[PDB]
RNA sequence: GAAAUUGUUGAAAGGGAAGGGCAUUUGAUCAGAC
RNA sequence: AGAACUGGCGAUGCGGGAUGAACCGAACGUAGAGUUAAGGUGCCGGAAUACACGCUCAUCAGACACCACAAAAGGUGUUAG
RNA sequence: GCCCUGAAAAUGGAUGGCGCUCAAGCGUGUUACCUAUACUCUACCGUCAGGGUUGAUAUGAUGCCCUGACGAGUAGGCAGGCGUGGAGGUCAGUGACGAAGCCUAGACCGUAAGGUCGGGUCGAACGGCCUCUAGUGCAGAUCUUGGUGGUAGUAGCAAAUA
RNA sequence: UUUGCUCCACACAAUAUAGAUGGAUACGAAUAAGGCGUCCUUGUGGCGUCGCUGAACCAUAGCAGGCUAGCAACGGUGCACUUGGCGGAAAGGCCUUGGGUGCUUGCUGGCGAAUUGCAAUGUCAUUUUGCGUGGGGAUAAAUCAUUUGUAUACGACUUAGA
C-alpha cells in the first residue's frame, strides 16, 4: 500500500501544528497557511484531490489529532495519527 | 565411427609340409581398413589354432550392398557381455541399407544395455524376405497398408534469440 | 557434549531485538478486517494511560 | 645526427626490485635473488614478480646507446673531450658531475667547436 | 538523409583467454548479422574504430580513436579477432566500435 | 540492433531465460524482464516446493542479518538465477546488473512497448509435452510472497485496455489493407513486384 | 609412436620442405644438389630427388642415406589429431600405433 | 643532519585489509629527435 | 607398518583435475605468428542452447579416473532380451 | 539397463556455482571450435661445439667473423663481474667559480650486482684506470647498542570518615 | 548573513559518459492449436485464407542535405498555439478538434559544390554544475545553550520557553 494524496482541513489548532514543529517559541508559525489558500474557493481546489481518493485509494484512512490541552499533562503538543475507516463504499468512507 | 562391411580373407603361412592352406573368409563391420584386419585376427583366433604372426592376411575387399534406396528389415542375432554375464540376443532394424543396420545396432545396444564396442559379436545379419516373418512388435508395427501419422508439436529452430511473435506448433 | 539436564531457554525469541522503540506513540500495524456492510466509523483511538 | 642503427629495443623497461620492497622500509630496493626453501618468487610461481636473467639481455648492435644514438663517455676536461674528435658520430660527451661552472663554459665551447654532441649541456648554467 | 552510417556495428566482448589467463593483445568482437565463420571471412582486415570522448582537447578535437584491424574469425558463431596498435582498454567489454568498409574487395 | 529488449517472460523457463538474458547484459544490451509471476520451472510443483524450503534453511548460523537472503518475489527468484551466471562481485559484474529490471506484471510505459520472446527459453519448445512444470507466481505464493492477488487485479484492467487498443488497430489496418489492394495492379505497383517489393 | 607406410607424395614432401643433412655433426638445410654432392657422392647420391630415390625404394645404401637426412622437426597437424583421446591405439579410436595408409595424412597435416 | 615516527599544504584512491604481476584507458610530468 | 621393478615429488614452475608436493598433459632464456596436448564448449568462461540414435521423472534424481564412498536383498516403475 | 526401497549425526552449503528434465542427465557416434612456458618458423640474448682470418693501415689474434646445436633446479661445485676500508703505480685526474655527504613517483646505461647525469642542501676534501691488501657487502640469530611507533589521550590517578 | 532562493528563455564556460550514430514497431489466449477476412440463425458456428520466421513493416534521394521556377492534387510530415478526453502499478504518457506556419523526392526544370589535395571518428549525442543577462514567483527553520523526566552510561529520547 502506498499513500496516493492527503488532504488536510481548511483550520488547524495550535495545538496540533506545534507537532510540525521543534521551536515553537521561534517561528512566524507559517503552518498550512499556504494551503488554507487552496481553501476559499467555491468548487475548485479541494474537490480534485477528494475525487483522487474517490477514484482510487482502495483504502482510507483519517488523520486525527488528540486534544491534550484537556488532560493535565504539560505537554502542550498533541498527537496525530491515522485511524483506518471500516466502513464501507469507500466513496463515502471520504465524505464522511 | 560410420560402419563399413569388408571381406576379409586370411590364411596360416604356408610350408614345406602343408602348402595351399584353407582361406578362411570373414564378413567384418568396422570404420577403417586396420580395424577390419585387426577384427578378423581377433575372431579368428577364437575358432582356429592361428595368430597374427602365424598366418597371413590374403585380401580384403569392402561390400557395399545391392540396393541402397530399397528398404529392408533385418534379423539380427548378436552376442554381448553385461556386466555378469554374457548373453545372446537377437532384434530387427528397418533401415535401407546393411551398415546402417549394424550402425543403429551399436547405438541400440549401447543405449539400452550399455554394451560397448568391445563388449559385442555380431553373430550375422539377415534379410526377412518375407513379411510376416517379423516378430517383434517394433518393427512389424510399420508394415501396414497405407500407413499414415502426423508430426504434432513442431518446433521451429529460430536464428535470431529474440522473436517478436508467439510460435505456433502447427504441423 | 550435551546439557546433562534439559531446561527451556529464556525469554522469547519473537520479540527480538530488545532495542528502544523509534517513538513514543507505537504505531498500529494491523486495522481490523473490513466488510463494507457497516456504517463508517473509526478503528481505534487515542488516550492517555 | 649519429650513426645509423637500428630500431632500438629494451625487452624490458621496468627496473626489477627486490621482492618485499614495497613491504618492509628495511628491504631496499636492490635486486637480490631470493635463496629460500619456500619462495613463490624462486620457484616462479604465476602472479609474482619476475626474476633478472640473461634473455633479457640487449641486442650487441644496439647496447649502451642512447636514444640519440651515441655511447656516453665521461669527460672532466679539455683534454678528455678532444679523444672524441674522429668520433663524434659514435660518442657523446657528457660533463663529469663535479666541474665547475667556469670550467664547463670552457668544454662546452671547445664541444661546438669540433662538432661533439654534448648530453648535458645544462648544468651549472648562471641565468 | 537520416542515415549516414558507413561502417557495421559492433561489440568488444573480450580479451583473448583461458578461463584463468587472459592475453590483453587479442581482443574479441561480435559483428551485427554475421553468425557464421563463412560470413565473418568477408570482414578480415577491415580497419576497425574504437571512438571516445574526453574532456581535454589534445589536437583540435575531444574525440579520440583507438585504430584496429580484423585479423581471423573465433569460434563457429560470427565472432572475430582484431589486434589494434594500442591494447583496448577492457573497460569496454560490451562498448560499440565501428568496423569498416575499407579496404575492400568489391 | 534494439535500445531497450523487454521480455515477455510468460511460457519461459527460469534458467534458460537467466543464461540466455545473462549473456545480453555482459554483451551490453540493456534488458527489461516483465511478467515474472508467470515464469516456468521445469519440474512437478511439489519439487519446486522443496527445493526452496531445502535454500529456506540455509541462513548464518550465529547471525540470520548477515547470512543468505531468501527474496520470495517471482521477480526477485528470476534476479537470483541470473547472478549466479554473472560475476556479480566485479565492476564489469555491476555494470552489467545495472542493464537488467525484473518487473512483476506489466507496468508503465513498458505497458505501451512492445514485447519480445526467446523462443530457446520458452516452455512449449523446450519442454516434452506432459512434463510438470510450475509457475513462479503460484510457487511465490506457497513461499511467502503477497502480491498474487493485486497483480492479478492489475492485469484483468491492464488486459481490458489493451484489447481496447487492440481492436482499434484492427479496423485501421483493414482501412490500409483496402486501400493497397485497390492501389494494386497499378503501373507503379507493377513495378515494384517485379523487384520483389 | 604413430607410424605407417608412407607414399611418394608424403616423403617427396618431407625432404623438399624439411630435409636437413647431417654435415660434420652441424645441422644443414639442403637447399642444393651440391650439398648432398659433396657427402652423399660415393654412393651414388647427387642430388635431393637422388635422395628420396634411396629411401623409397630401400637401396644397399639406405642406411648411409636416412642416417645423412636429420630427424625431421614436425608441428602438430593443422587439421588437429583426428581423435579426442591420443594416447589410445588406432585401433581402439587413439592415436598410437600402426596406421597402414593413414600417415600420410597425419605427416602432411605436420608438415 | 639519514631512517623509523610526526605536523602542515598539495594530489589521488578507498562497500570486510593493503601491498604485487601482464596489458591498456585516463590525468600529471618528461627525455630524445627537428 | 615392511619390501621388488620402474616412474616421480624432494629439487618444479606451466596447461588441465574448482580446490591439492605425488594424478593427466607437458618440463621453462626474451618475444612474435601458427598448431595442438590433457581438459573442455548453457551462463559464470575462451569455445556448437552442434548434429544423430536411444534411455531416465526420482514426495532425499543424475552429472567424468586418482577422488573424496555405499552393500546384500527387493519393485506389473519402464525398456530390451 | 535406467529409476525407486533398502539409505540414520550432529553451525547453513555445495555435480565448483547458478541452474538444467525429447537436458545443460546417462550410453554411444560424427564434425566444428577454444587454449600450455608443449610442437613448427623467425628475431634477439647467453652457453657449448666446430671452423675462417697476421695481409698491408688502425691500435682489442684473449680480436673480427662464419656455422650448428642447446638453455628447469634445492644442497653443492666451478666461472665471469658489481661494491667497501686501506697500499704501489699513473691520469702534470676533480675541487672554496663549491670536494665529500645527504634528499629528489626528473633523465640515461647495464639482464643484474650497480654506474652516470640534472636540481636542492652543504662546506674541504675526493675519484677513473693497472695492480696489491683485508676487521670488505645483512632481513632475520627471543642477534648487540641506540632510537621510534600502533596500542593510546587508553588502563588508570577509587584503602586510611570531610 | 550587504542583494540571498526558485522557475522560465538564451549566453558562454566547465564537467563527465559501462558507450545514440534511421524507428524499443504495444491484444489476449492456445500450442494434440491459432491469426485474419466474410456470412448468418451470434456460436465452442459456417466458408476462405495465412504461417513453414523480423531476410518483416515503416522510414529512407537533396551542401551533415543549399538557393530558386513551374505542374498535379487539398494529401504527408515537423513546429509553436488551441478544443476535448483517457491513463495512479513506477500514472508523467496516449488519443483528439480548429487555425497558423515551414518543408514536401507526387512530377518536370535552373543555379552551387572542387583545394579536407589518395584514407585519417574528421567532431553534428546528453550528464551535471557554474557565471551572466530579462521575466515572473515567495519571504523559513534546525542545532547549541536554558528547561522536563513518560528517557537516560555518554550520545540519543520526550517536553517547555518572545
Redesign the pocket.
Known sequence: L?S??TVWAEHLSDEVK??????????????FT?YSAKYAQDGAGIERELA?IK???SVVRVLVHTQIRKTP?????A?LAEIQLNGGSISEKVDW | ??FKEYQVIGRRLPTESVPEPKLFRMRIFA?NEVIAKSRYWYFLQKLHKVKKASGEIVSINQINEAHPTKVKNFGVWVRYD???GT??????IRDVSRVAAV??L???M????????RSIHILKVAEIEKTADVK???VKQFLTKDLKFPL?????????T?????????? | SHRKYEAPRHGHLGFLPRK?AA??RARVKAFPKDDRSKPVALTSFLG?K | ??LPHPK?????T???????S???????????K?????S?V?????????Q???????????????????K?F?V??V??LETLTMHTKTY?A???????????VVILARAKALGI?V??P????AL | ???????V?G????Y???????????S?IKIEGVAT?QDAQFYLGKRI?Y??????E??????????GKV?????????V?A?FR???????????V?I?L?PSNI | ??????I?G??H????????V??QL?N?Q?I?VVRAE?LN????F??NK?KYH??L??????NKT???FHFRAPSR?FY????????HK???????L??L?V?????????????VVV????R??????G??YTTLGKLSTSVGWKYED??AK??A???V???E??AK???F??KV?SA?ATAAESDVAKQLAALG? | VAYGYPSYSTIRQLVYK?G?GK???????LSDNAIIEANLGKYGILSIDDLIHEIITVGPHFKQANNFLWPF???????????????KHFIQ???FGNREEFINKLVK??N
Do not use: C
Open positions: 502506498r496516493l494524496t506545534r507537532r510540525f514543529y521543534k521551536n515553537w517559541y521561534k517561528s512566524k508559525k507559517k503552518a499556504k483522487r477514484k482510487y485509494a499533562l504539560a505537554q502542550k503538543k498527537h | 565411427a560410420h570404420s553385461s556386466r555378469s548373453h545372446n540376443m537377437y532384434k530387427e550402425e543403429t551399436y547405438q541400440d549401447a543405449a539400452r544395455h550399455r554394451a560397448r564396442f517383434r512388435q517394433y504434432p508439436h513442431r518446433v521451429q529452430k529460430s536464428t535470431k529474440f522473436s517478436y511473435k508467439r510460435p505456433s506448433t502447427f504441423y | 528502544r517513538s513514543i492517555y | 645526427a649519429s632500438i629495443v629494451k625487452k624490458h621496468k627496473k626489477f626490485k627486490r621482492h618485499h614495497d613491504r618492509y622500509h628495511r628491504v631496499a630496493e636492490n635486486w637480490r631470493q635463496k629460500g626453501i619456500d613463490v624462486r620457484r616462479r610461481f604465476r602472479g609474482n614478480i619476475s633478472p636473467k640473461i634473455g633479457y639481455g640487449s641486442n650487441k648492435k644496439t647496447k649502451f646507446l642512447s636514444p640519440s644514438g651515441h656516453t665521461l672532466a676536461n683534454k678528455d657523446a657528457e660533463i663529469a658531475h663535479n666541474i665547475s661552472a667556469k670550467n664547463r654532441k648530453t648535458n645544462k648544468g651549472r648554467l | 538523409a537520416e542515415s549516414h552510417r558507413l561502417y556495428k561489440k568488444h566482448l573480450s583473448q583467454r583461458s578461463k584463468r589467463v587472459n592475453n590483453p593483445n587479442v574479441l565463420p574504430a571512438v571516445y570522448r574526453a574532456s581535454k589534445v589536437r583540435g578535437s575531444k574525440i579520440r580513436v583507438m585504430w585479423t581471423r574469425t573465433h569460434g563457429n558463431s560470427g565472432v579477432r589486434t594500442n591494447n583496448l582498454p577492457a573497460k569496454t567489454f560490451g562498448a560499440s565501428r569498416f575499407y | 540492433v534494439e535500445p531497450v529488449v523487454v515477455d510468460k511460457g523457463l527460469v534458467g534458460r531465460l537467466a543464461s540466455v545473462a549473456k555482459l551490453g540493456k527489461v508467470e520451472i521445469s519440474g512437478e511439489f519439487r522443496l531445502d535454500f534453511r540455509k541462513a548464518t548460523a550465529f548477515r547470512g543468505p527468484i537470483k538465477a541470473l547472478r549466479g551466471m554473472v560475476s566485479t565492476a564489469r559484474g555491476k555494470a552489467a545495472e542493464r529490471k518487473f512483476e506484471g506489466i507496468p508503465p510505459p513498458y505497458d505501451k512497448k512492445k514485447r523462443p530457446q527459453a520458452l512449449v519448445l523446450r519442454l516434452k509435452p512434463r510438470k493485486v497483480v492489475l492485469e484492467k491492464r488486459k485496455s489493451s484489447a487498443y487492440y488497430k484492427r479496423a489496418t483493414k489493407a493497397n517489393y | 624439411r636437413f654435415i660434420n655433426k652441424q645441422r644443414v638445410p622437426k614436425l608441428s602438430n597437424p593443422s587439421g588437429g589429431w583426428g581423435v579426442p583421446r591420443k594416447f579410436g587413439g592415436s597435416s605436420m
